């Protein structure tokens, strides 16, 4: 199941620490259904190069952007804890995605305008998960959120700044 997926992740890593191998990954990405393949890469990133997988993910910003949308918050925080080069990249997508949103006064939420825009609940959930991560990570996340809030003007009233609002949801008194 996830035993199929462990096996497949082992086989992909064994084939990469051996063997292209950026060219292998690119042909696998064009050939395999993307859903399957993102999950296998996720498992490959968590196995006891690999640094070859990471480099290739840094090199393919579209592929990693989909990885970051498709996979659960908690999985993303695991992957990004182990592989810190993926960290500023995750945070940058998150920041970009959050900037796309605006405040719908009638619904009382932050909403996008394009199909691909990330929902508020998803952004909230990704940051909540990142904010419960082991030290080097929790602090880079916190700083990023504060940096953006300060950039918007350090507002505390709701509906101005997504970052004000996210930090209010994320902090508990
Ligand atoms: Hg931010």
Domain locations in the chain?
A: 1-173
- The CATH-assigned architecture of domain 1-173 is Alpha Horseshoe (1.25)
* DSSP notation for 28-56: HHHHS-HHHHHHHHHHHHT----HHHHHH
Distance in Å, CA 25 to ligand 1 centroid: 30
Judged on CB neighbours under 10 Å (0-12, 13-18, 19+), 128 is: middle
d(CA 35, CA 115): 19
Q: Are 149 and 98 in contact (CB under 8 A)?
A: no
Scanning the structure block, which residue is given the tokens 């953006």? 148
Distance in Å, CA 51 to ligand 1 centroid: 26
Distance in Å, CA 145 to ligand 1 centroid: 4
Distance in Å, CA 20 to ligand 1 centroid: 36
């Amino acid at each position: 199941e996830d035993s199929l997926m462990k096996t497949q992740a082992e086989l992909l890593l064994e084939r990469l620490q051996e063997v292209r191998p950026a060219r292998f990954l690119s042909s696998l990405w064009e050939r395999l259904p993307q859903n399957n393949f993102l999950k296998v890469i996720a498992v490959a990133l968590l196995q006891p190069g690999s640094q070859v997988l990471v480099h290739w993910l840094l090199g393919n910003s579209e592929v990693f952007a989909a990885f970051c949308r498709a996979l659960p918050a908690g999985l993303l925080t695991l992957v990004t804890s182990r592989h810190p080069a993926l960290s500023p990249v995750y945070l940058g997508l998150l920041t970009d995605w959050g900037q796309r949103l605006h405040y719908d006064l009638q619904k009382g939420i932050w909403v996008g305008t394009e199909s691909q825009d990330v929902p508020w609940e998803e952004l909230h959930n990704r940051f909540q998960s990142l904010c419960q991560a082991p030290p080097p990570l929790k602090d880079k996340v916190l700083t990023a959120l504060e940096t953006c809030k300060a950039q918007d003007g350090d507002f505390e009233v709701p509906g101005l700044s997504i970052w004000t609002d996210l930090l209010l949801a994320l902090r508990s008194g």
